[PDB]
Amino acid sequence: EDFDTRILEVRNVFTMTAKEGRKKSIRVLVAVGNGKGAAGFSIGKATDRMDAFRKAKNRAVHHLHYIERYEDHTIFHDISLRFKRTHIKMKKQPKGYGLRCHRAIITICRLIGIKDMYAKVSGSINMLSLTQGLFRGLSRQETHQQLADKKGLHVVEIREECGPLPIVVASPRGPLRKDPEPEDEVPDVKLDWEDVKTAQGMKRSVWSNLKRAAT
């Protein structure tokens, strides 16, 4: 009863069989989530749409991922992954930012229980590829506690609204390293041209930041 089911796509697949020629069938992709980080998705093939719905949701309830959420409202870190031909770039966002994501991602995030997040989808917008790539990226994310345990260091959060106060969100459960992490003046990371252009303000777009309904 805690779980909600949402349809992501319904498709009328027509199969050529030897006797009947073109035969209609319904392929339905559903996602189920309880709103508390446990969610999954499944495909259901049937002759009738309702049978497809039943199959898909009863199968998705057995394939539940668990999406770790930072402060139970957003992802732990920025994610950028390509599944097949679909690029998903999700950005962790502060409280009140809302869900500015592809409508399918909005639905899946509501099912998971993510309230604040950004997401840009590039490449093919295949609904199934997008959905399962999103689930892969969300499942593979690393929590602050996991990071602290891995590197044996305090994970200190710096908030502009809280000024220079250092907030410790995760401390390693084992020994704490004494040697400071090397502070390279130039980090070696692969930036996104879209993000850089947006930060510099050159990302002029008549479609970005358009006022939209509450998510």
Binding site: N12, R22, R49
Partner: peptide, 21 residues
Amino acid sequence: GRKRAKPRLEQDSSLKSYLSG
């Protein structure tokens, strides 16, 4: 001959019925 509608363009009113009640 006469027109033959494409199989993929045929309307479905099941969703209309579901939204109606």
